[PDB]
Structure 1
Amino acid sequence: AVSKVYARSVYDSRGNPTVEVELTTEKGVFRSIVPSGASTGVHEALEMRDGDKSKWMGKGVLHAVKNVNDVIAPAFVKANIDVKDQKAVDDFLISLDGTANKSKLGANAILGVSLAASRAAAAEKNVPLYKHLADLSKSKTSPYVLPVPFLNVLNGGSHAGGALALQEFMIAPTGAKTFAEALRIGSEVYHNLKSLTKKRYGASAGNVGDEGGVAPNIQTAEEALDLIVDAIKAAGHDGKVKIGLDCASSEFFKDGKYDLDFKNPNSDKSKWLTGPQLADLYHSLMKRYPIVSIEDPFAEDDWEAWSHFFKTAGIQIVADDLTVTNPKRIATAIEKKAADALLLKVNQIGTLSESIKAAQDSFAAGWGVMVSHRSGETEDTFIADLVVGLRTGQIKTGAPARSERLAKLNQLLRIEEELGDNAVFAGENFHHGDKL
């Protein structure tokens, strides 16, 4: 029985405010912190921002906090809802908002409460969070599955100087026998990579981006890939570590063509590519490097490009901007066979219930689900329990640097330990961890 609902403003990993919510019941006080999403998006749930240029550069969340304290709290408390019933909880908040995009209350206000309720329910049931999550999602818990962590290690695209258009380069320690082992190997690689970067690109090159990876001035994709290969070798993990890529192609998509030199204000339209030309480029890289996952290879609305590439690509293809954790977009993607893996951002949708259904719908279609962090994260470890609870076998939660990232990885080490014999590391079979 919830006796109180309260919110306050706290800071995310990048120094911007975000919402923190507190739910109190007879078992104690349960908290959740919302990562940073969108205030102005077409398909996503909207996060409410204060917009007062006089405070926090216009990024405050006092309005959103006020919605929780003064709008949601009274009603919720009065409603006397069973927190164990996540669905009723979420339906309640949704109805209160009454908008399709949670634009009345703000998706940041709604979500905080959604997740806190889950924490409360787990305490009530006297079980760990991931177990309660497994219950809510009807996932197999015999055994449970630990995910392969896709570690951000190097960044390109809008995150760095240099011509390199591809946004994220990650490592996936699929060859490990345990999560703890996958994490150690991953950390060794990262360290080796950091050192090589400093050596070749200069000390300043060691500074990290929002997610903990480095971002030297790289000029080509081969350059970056070679670098990573060298780090794996140096760490002595050849054959045990694969590469994941986030092309974030919507950033260089122009006039139906893809500008690989989008960084050049003077890019040559002559050289811009068509989706098929671009597809051929990726096929080439795939043939030369151990790439096992590719996210957003094509633009958000370029359905045709995605379907074409999908037909002949043999690795996991992840949809991020193409689907924006949106039910309608997911349905379209599925039907068109545009990809086979969905990057799940709880905050893009706004409630635990909807998030769960999105994953379910995805699994039902034979697709994988990569649970993901946001660039502006917090010390909240929810996602760690979520990836285990949904049994996806794969998570994207930053480099093995910056505590907003590590906090999740650490929670995973904890979970694995606790599960003992009752859990398995997804390893090479991460694409379908739910079916293991």
Structure 2
Amino acid sequence: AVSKVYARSVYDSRGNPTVEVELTTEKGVFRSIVPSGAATGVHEALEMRDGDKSKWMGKGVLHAVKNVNDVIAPAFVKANIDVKDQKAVDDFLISLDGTANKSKLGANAILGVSLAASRAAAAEKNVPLYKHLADLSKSKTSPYVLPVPFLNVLNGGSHAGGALALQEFMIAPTGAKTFAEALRIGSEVYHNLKSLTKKRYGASAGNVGDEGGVAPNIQTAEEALDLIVDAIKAAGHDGKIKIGLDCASSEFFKDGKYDLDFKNPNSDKSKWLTGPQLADLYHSLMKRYPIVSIEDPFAEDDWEAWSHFFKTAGIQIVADALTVTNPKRIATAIEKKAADALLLKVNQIGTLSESIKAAQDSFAAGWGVMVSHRSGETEDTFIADLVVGLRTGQIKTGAPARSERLAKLNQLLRIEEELGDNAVFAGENFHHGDKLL
């Protein structure tokens, strides 16, 4: 029985406020914290900010917090809902607001309750959270599938100061045989990368971006990728580490074209790329580098560019801003053959149940699903249990630096230990971890 629902303001990993929810039951007090994006898609569910210029430069969440305490909490408590019935929980929360994008109460008001309810339910059931989430999503558990971590070891775009337009350069240790192996050897590549970046581009190029990646002041995707391959090799892991990109191309889409110098206000417009031109750039990288995944290669409503590119792509293509973890937009993407993997960000849609549905829809279409952090993250480790429960085979949750990133990666170590012989590491089958064995 839920006796109390309570929200407070706490700080994310960028030092900006966000919403934390505690739900109290007979089993104790369950806490969940809402993350926050920087490269948010225009179609995301509403993140409610106070806009009081006198406090946190307008970025307060006291209104969202108030909506939990004054509106969601009494309704929830009075309703006497079975927290084990997540669909009931989320149907109820969704009905409190009654707008598709949660504009009345805020996605950041609703989500903390949704997540905390799932934590309470697992406790009531005496099971680890990942087991409960497998139950909610009707996923296979014999074996569980541990994910390949896509580690964002060099940050650019909206996540780091510097000229580099592409947002994320990730290594993926698909050749590892365990999750603990994958994390160890990924951490070794990262340390090599930091040393080498500081040898090449100066000591300050080793300071980190928002997601813990090194942030050299470079201009080209090729210079980022040459550095990463040098680190893969120097660490002794050639052949066992692949690369993923998140272009976050919506961040640099202007007036039908793509500005690869978008953080320079005097960027030369005659150098901006058309869709076809950016596709040629991708194909070039794909041919020269061990790239096995590309995320948001085109902008969030540039559907024809996605569809055209996908036709000849033949590696994993991940929809992030295109789909906003929204079953409606995923349906359109599947119809158009725009991509073949979903980036699952629970706070884009705002409930656990809608997120599970979006994963289930993706799998049903033969798509992969990469569970993801936000660039504004917290000590919360929910997504570690989520990507195991959903059996997806792949997570991105930061470089192996900054503890809003390691908190999830350490939790994955703990889950792998607990599972023992009842889990397998997805390795080279990451795209379809859900069908493995």
**Is the TM value for this pair above 0.5?**
yes
C-alpha separation in 2, matches of 1:374 and 1:295: 14
Deviation, structure 1 residue 323? 1.3
> More displaced, 351-360 or 217-226?
217-226
Deviation, structure 1 residue 38? 8.3
For structure 2, the residue ranges without an aligned partner over 5 or more in a row are none
Task: Say if 1:271 and 1:19 are closer, same or farther in 2 by CA, change over 3 A.
Answer: closer
Deviation, structure 1 residue 264? 4.7
Task: Say if 1:49 and 1:88 are closer, same or farther in 2 by CA, change over 3 A.
Answer: same
Deviation, structure 1 residue 2? 0.7
C-alpha separation in 2, matches of 1:290 and 1:40: 28
Task: Say if 1:270 and 1:69 are closer, same or farther in 2 by CA, change over 3 A.
Answer: closer
> More displaced, 195-204 or 396-405?
195-204
Kept in 2: contact 1:161–1:218 (CA 8 A): no
SS at match of 1:312: coil
SS at match of 2:339: coil
C-alpha separation in 1, matches of 2:376 and 2:24: 26
TM-score by length of 2: 0.96
Kept in 1: contact 2:148–2:182 (CA 8 A): yes
SS at match of 1:163: coil
C-alpha separation in 2, matches of 1:309 and 1:40: 23
CA offsets 1:374-395 (integer angstroms, 9 cap, x no match): 1111101000000000001000
C-alpha separation in 2, matches of 1:270 and 1:22: 52
CA offsets 1:123-152 (integer angstroms, 9 cap, x no match): 111100000000000001010000000001
Kept in 1: contact 2:39–2:158 (CA 8 A): no
Kept in 2: contact 1:150–1:395 (CA 8 A): yes
For structure 1, the residue ranges without an aligned partner over 5 or more in a row are none
Deviation, structure 1 residue 223? 1.2
Deviation, structure 1 residue 277? 2.4
SS at match of 2:311: helix
Deviation, structure 1 residue 162? 5.3
C-alpha separation in 2, matches of 1:126 and 1:78: 25
Deviation, structure 1 residue 33? 0.9
Task: Say if 1:267 and 1:4 are closer, same or farther in 2 by CA, change over 3 A.
Answer: closer
Task: Say if 1:218 and 1:42 are closer, same or farther in 2 by CA, change over 3 A.
Answer: closer
Deviation, structure 1 residue 256? 2.0
Kept in 1: contact 2:10–2:19 (CA 8 A): yes
SS at match of 2:131: helix
Task: Say if 1:313 and 1:40 are closer, same or farther in 2 by CA, change over 3 A.
Answer: closer
C-alpha separation in 1, matches of 2:349 and 2:166: 26
Deviation, structure 1 residue 169? 0.4
Query: Would you say how many aligned residue pairs link Structure 1 and Structure 2?
Result: 436
Q: Equivalent pairs: percent with the same residue?
A: 99
C-alpha separation in 2, matches of 1:173 and 1:193: 15
> More displaced, 35-44 or 253-262?
35-44
Kept in 2: contact 1:39–1:46 (CA 8 A): no
Q: Does residue 194 of the first structure (1) align with residue 194 of the second (2)?
A: yes
Kept in 2: contact 1:40–1:46 (CA 8 A): no
Kept in 1: contact 2:173–2:185 (CA 8 A): yes
> More displaced, 388-397 or 47-56?
47-56
Task: Say if 1:201 and 1:37 are closer, same or farther in 2 by CA, change over 3 A.
Answer: closer
Kept in 2: contact 1:160–1:217 (CA 8 A): no
Deviation, structure 1 residue 103? 1.5
C-alpha separation in 2, matches of 1:25 and 1:349: 26
C-alpha separation in 1, matches of 2:103 and 2:156: 33
Deviation, structure 1 residue 97? 1.2
C-alpha separation in 2, matches of 1:40 and 1:146: 28
Task: Say if 1:36 and 1:260 are closer, same or farther in 2 by CA, change over 3 A.
Answer: closer
Kept in 2: contact 1:165–1:263 (CA 8 A): yes
CA offsets 1:189-226 (integer angstroms, 9 cap, x no match): 00000011111111111111111011111122221111
Deviation, structure 1 residue 255? 2.5
C-alpha separation in 1, matches of 2:245 and 2:74: 46
C-alpha separation in 2, matches of 1:93 and 1:37: 22
Deviation, structure 1 residue 265? 4.2
CA offsets 1:313-348 (integer angstroms, 9 cap, x no match): 110001111112222211111100000011111001
Task: Say if 1:255 and 1:50 are closer, same or farther in 2 by CA, change over 3 A.
Answer: closer
CA offsets 1:265-322 (integer angstroms, 9 cap, x no match): 4444444333222212211111111000001111111111111110111100011111
Task: Say if 1:70 and 1:91 are closer, same or farther in 2 by CA, change over 3 A.
Answer: same
